[PDB]
Every structure is written in C-alpha cells, then in structure tokens.
Amino acid sequence: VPPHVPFELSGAELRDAIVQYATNPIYHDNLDWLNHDNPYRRQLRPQVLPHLDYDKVPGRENILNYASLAVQRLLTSVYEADLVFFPKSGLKGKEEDFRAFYSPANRALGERIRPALERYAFGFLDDEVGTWTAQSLDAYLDSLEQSPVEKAILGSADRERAARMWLVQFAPDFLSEASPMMRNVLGYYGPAQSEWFKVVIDEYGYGVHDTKHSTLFERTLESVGLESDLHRYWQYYLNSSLLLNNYFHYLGKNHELFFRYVGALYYTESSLVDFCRRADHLLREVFGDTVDTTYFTEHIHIMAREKIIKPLVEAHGDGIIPEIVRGIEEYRVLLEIGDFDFSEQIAWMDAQPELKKLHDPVFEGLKQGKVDAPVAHLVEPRGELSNTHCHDGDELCHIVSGTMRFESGLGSSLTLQAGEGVVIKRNRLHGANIESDECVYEIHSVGDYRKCL
C-alpha cells in the first residue's frame, strides 16, 4: 500500500488556486450596480485576490477587513454551486453563464480551496467560544428591550431606506430557505433524520409553491419596491450577512459539524418567534399597511429538544454535547457581528452629507502634515465602476476634476464634483462610478481620519 500524502494547500499555491477559481469570467466586475436577473454572476473582484495573505487567519477584531469580505464572497459562490438556480425569465439567453457556473471545472476549483477559505472565515471562532453530561446540558439549555436592528432602522434619518437595506441582506438566505438545512437529511441514519425532515417539510410548505417560505419572502420584497431575483443586490451584501448565511452551508456541507447544526437548530427555532415578531412590528411601523409580512407571521403560527437532541445524546453519547453547545455559541457570536456591522453601515449611509462636508477639514490637516498619509492619483473614464468593497483604514477621496457617483449603500449616493470629496470610513461597504468623460481624483490613506482634524 503506497503511503498517504496529507492534503496540503498553502502559500503561493493557495493564492494561485484562489485566483484560478475566481478568474472565471462570471465572477468579474459588473458594469452596473445590480445583477439583471442572472443568478450565475457573482462579483468577487478577482483583480485583488493575488495581493492577499490567506495563510494569516484573522481574529474577531479584523473579520470586517476587506480580505474577510473577499473570502465571504468566494465562500458564498463556492457553496451555492450545489444549489439549483434559474432566472425568473428563464434560462433562454443565459445558457453560457449557466454552463460556466455549473461545470466540472468550477466546482472542483472551489472545493479544492474551500478548506482554506473555511479557515479564514471561521478560524476566529476558536478563540470566541470540556466534558458534559445530559444534566449540565439541560440547565444550559434552560438559561436561554429594543434590538440593535430596531434602533438603527427606527433611529435612521431615512427609515424606509434603512429597512430596505435590511431586507436585501436576507435574500441569499430566505429565497433559498432551508437549503442549508436539507444538507443534513441526506443519507441514512436514525429516527432523527425523519424528525429533521419534518422541519424541512414545513420549511418547503408541504410541496405547495404558494405556502413555500421562499415565495412568502418574495411578496415581502415585492411589497416595498424590491425585486426577488438572485443575486440582484450582491454588491449591497454586508460582510456579516454572507458570514451568517455561509455558516449554515459550513455546518451543512461538513457533516463532522452535524451536532453543531443540531445546537444551532434549537437556538434558531427558540428565538425565531421573537425575531419574526420584531420584524413584523418594525416593517409595519416603517412602511405601514402596504408591507406584506406574512412570511414572518407564518413562523409565529408554527419538538427539537425531545425529538432530536434527546435521542441523539442517548444513541451517540455525551461526547457530542460540547459540539451542540459550540454550535449555539458560535451562532450567537455571529449574530452580534451582524448587529454591529449593520448598525455601522446605516450610520455610515445616513452621515453621507456630513462626511462629504467633513472632506474639507480633513483635507486641510493633510496639507499641514497633521498626519503623513500615502496618496494615490487616479484618472478613470466614465463607466469605470469600482465594485463595492471596503478598506482597513479610513481614506480621503478628493475630486480634482470631473463628476463621480460615490455609493455607500442601496439608496445612498453622493455626487462629487471638482474640488469636493468624502471621508470613507474603514470596513464600510462602498463603491464608485465615473459620470463624466474623465475624472481625476486622489485617495489619501489617512488611517484614523480624526488625526487630521
């Protein structure tokens, strides 16, 4: 028997393999802000991946840096190759993009880099979350006010724009609802398999398309002027949103974390009533009667501890309890990241007029060397659309000549003319496009922008 060479992929061979998967033309930069009914095109900005270090796994203080957002976009596209998508208007015309996403090359390229991507995205959870008995697990299970999402949407200068930015975050999740959960009911195991499929049955709405939860979220999006084609608002997905959705494909694809999904299954269903009640009350508060919230209220109309957790512990032993606990705590940490990330973006979107005015005083500090900041000069023609991204330090955009559309979120835009600019806060999703025949502008890497005031 020949010796086994352990699987290894790191260093430059990892960067080349990640670039290889992402250089597929369906992943290149979009010329518009939205995807036009094409579920096979996902913008991964491949021109930046060669310059990132995937060997250096970041901590929680740095999971909002661009490399983590770049990895989230790669992981979403890698996971979703197992899911069936077709445009709302049909496959006719998009056959070539359909073949470039579902091909023997695309999945193998993404599956070979998945272990390394799955460690840059979730490696920090080891520092954020012993032996257990069924008795200790019970008490921990028994020990489980305005939400941060309510404060940001209700306290926003534009409540409707804030809520619409919140709804599109659930597009990859709710429109393919229970797709990650179904990864566990494949195979052959005990009665817990039928019990888990019982959740999927309700999650798919008995087979009827009208009561399917994915169709319910369509009417929710269509009631506020938003579309339901994936992935229309891909460029408006926050880092934390992809992190939350990718976590269940992470738990669902890798069956060694099957008991971690069992823990997160309890926590979601036991917190789902309060979440759906808050979403229904908040949406009707922002939009009124015109909003369709049947998706959330149906969940209140609708078994895991006795019918799944208990028989699994009796059959597979007490050694699986820490993983059930770890799945609960890992998910709670991720929810905290979403509340912080989403609240920072809304405040960043609402403060756009003042951060544009703030460009002046920051610009004077640099001219007086209050800080020493690297500068880059750029000349781009109209239609050079920088896809949405973020930076690890604050930047000062200064427009010398021309006209630029600075994007900070769905419905949040600034027109920047000659002599004007904007202060770009770090870790915030943002992009830009040129609206004039030519635009000359500068980018100042000031680190902390408050050091220039």
Indicate which of Fe ion, a copy of itself, none lies near residue 167 (CB less than 5 to 8 Å, by partner kind).
Answer: none
Alpha-carbon dihedral of residues 292, 296, 299, 301, nearest 10 degrees?
A: -50
Q: Which is nearer to Fe ion, 213 or 326 (CB)?
A: 213
Q: Does 425 bind Fe ion (CB under 5 A)?
A: no
Q: How far is the CB of 73 from a copy of itself (least distance, A)?
A: 15
Q: Which is nearer to a copy of itself, 31 or 375 (CB)?
A: 31
CA–CA gap between residue 140 and residue 153 (Å, rounded) = 33
Q: Tokens 């999650």 correspond to what residue? A: 203
Q: How far is the CB of 237 from a copy of itself (least distance, A)?
A: 15
Length of the chain: 453
Buried b (16+ CB within 10 A) or exposed e, 39-48: bbbbbbbbee
Q: How far is the CB of 191 from a copy of itself (least distance, A)?
A: 4
CA–CA gap between residue 271 and residue 382 (Å, rounded) = 48
Residue 4, annotated as binding a ligand: no
The 3-state DSSP class for residue 439 equals strand
Q: Which of 322, 302, 405, 334 minimizes the C-alpha distance to 63? A: 334
Indicate which of a copy of itself, Fe ion, none lies near residue 47 (CB less than 5 to 8 Å, by partner kind).
Answer: a copy of itself
Residue 430, annotated as binding a ligand: yes
User: Taking a C-beta distance cutoff of 8 angstroms, is the pair 219, 212 a contact?
Assistant: no
Q: Which is nearer to a copy of itself, 7 or 354 (CB)?
A: 7
Indicate which of a copy of itself, Fe ion, none lies near residue 187 (CB less than 5 to 8 Å, by partner kind).
Answer: a copy of itself
CA–CA gap between residue 245 and residue 171 (Å, rounded) = 10
Indicate which of a copy of itself, Fe ion, none lies near residue 271 (CB less than 5 to 8 Å, by partner kind).
Answer: none
DSSP result, 403-437: -EEEEEETTEEEEE-TT-EEEE-TT--EEEEE-SS
# residues near Fe ion by CB under 5 A: 2
Residue 8, annotated as binding a ligand: no
Indicate which of a copy of itself, Fe ion, none lies near residue 319 (CB less than 5 to 8 Å, by partner kind).
Answer: a copy of itself
Residue 269, annotated as binding a ligand: yes
Residues paired with 107 in a beta bridge: none
**What is the dihedral sign for C-alpha 249, 253, 257, 263?**
positive
Q: How far is the CB of 93 from a copy of itself (least distance, A)?
A: 9
Residue 391, annotated as binding a ligand: yes
From edge to edge, which strands make up the β-sheet containing 375-381?
375-381, 438-447, 394-401, 421-424
Binding mask 202-221 for Fe ion (x = CB under 5 A): -x---------x--------
Residue 209, annotated as binding a ligand: no
The 3-state DSSP class for residue 376 equals strand
Residue 213, annotated as binding a ligand: yes
Q: How far is the CB of 213 from Fe ion (least distance, A)?
A: 4
Q: Which is nearer to Fe ion, 136 or 270 (CB)?
A: 270
Q: Which is nearer to a copy of itself, 133 or 415 (CB)?
A: 133
Q: Tokens 């990132």 correspond to what residue? A: 52
Residue 203, annotated as binding a ligand: yes
Half-sphere exposure of 451 (CA within 13 A, CB side): 15
Cα-based angle 108, 52, 370 (whole degrees, multiple of 5): 160
Indicate which of a copy of itself, Fe ion, none lies near residue 5 (CB less than 5 to 8 Å, by partner kind).
Answer: a copy of itself
CA–CA gap between residue 238 and residue 244 (Å, rounded) = 10
Q: How far is the CB of 253 from Fe ion (least distance, A)?
A: 20
Q: How far is the CB of 90 from a copy of itself (least distance, A)?
A: 4
Indicate which of Fe ion, a copy of itself, none lies near residue 320 (CB less than 5 to 8 Å, by partner kind).
Answer: a copy of itself
| CA gyration radius, the chain | 23
Indicate which of a copy of itself, Fe ion, none lies near residue 98 (CB less than 5 to 8 Å, by partner kind).
Answer: a copy of itself
Binding stretches for Fe ion (CB under 5 A): 203, 213
Binding residues for Fe(2+): 177, 203, 213, 269, 299, 389, 391, 430
